[PDB]
Design a protein around this ligand. Sequence first.
Ligand code: 9AH
Ligand code: 9AH
Lengths: 133, 133
Amino acid sequence: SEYQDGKEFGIGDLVWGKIKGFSWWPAMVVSWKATSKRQAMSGMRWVQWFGDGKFSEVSADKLVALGLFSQHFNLATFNKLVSYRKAMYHALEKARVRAGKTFPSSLEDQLKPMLEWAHGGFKPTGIEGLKPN
Amino acid sequence: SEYQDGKEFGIGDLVWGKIKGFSWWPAMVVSWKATSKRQAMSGMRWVQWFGDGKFSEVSADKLVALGLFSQHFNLATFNKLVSYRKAMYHALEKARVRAGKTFPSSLEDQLKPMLEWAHGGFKPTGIEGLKPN
Ligand SMILES: CCCN(CCC)CCCC#N
Ligand SMILES: CCCN(CCC)CCCC#N
């Protein structure tokens, strides 16, 4: 099937993705049929970037689980770029619903506890709660 | 193991491939399991074409290593079809990454230094740098 090349990551997976000129960026792995483009080359994945909803063909060697959060969260980029803060919001929101996590009740202010939850290791489910389906 | 008929080219190799009615086209040799089709016949190879990401079963004798770049690159086709130019970009991009080569950073514009690198034998690495792994 699609993405049956031995490498990691399948459809639905929340990932960090690395492309030239950008900090690690949160994304969702999608099927090529969602992209309106073409099938990924072997060992690549199509991902859709949180925050801007664009698609990129990214090597699987340039992706890591979003659950490895503190290891790829870029604090400098976060402070610098409103777009990265929005990406974080939409990415963590998707994570929060998957994990069955809920927070008490702006943007900065809504991000704050999802960001702590993420940086803290996604307790109580851990990364296990970030899986799709 | 698949493709052990003694012939040339293994999974991951970057190649030029010739099919009826087309110029030599860049591709990667894939396992039949990535194709969502069938196993390959004796002495055949599945290849995935750069640019369109499509799959074809090709004889291991209608295939040359991508390293023989200038001999098979087709300037008339390049100037004529944007599809070939895109195919070229993606193939060299994969080549670039495997080699550890880097280019200071448009299409044709991004293409010109990669393409000069290939026409000149992929220095400082040679064709040894296009191999998989
Ligand atoms: C097509 C890529 C757009 N980029 C996705 C992450 C690399 C985010 C752009 C917003 C910024 N900075
Ligand atoms: C060998 C090249 C074949 N390729 C796809 C074959 C299904 C067409 C390339 C697009 C053009 N022109």
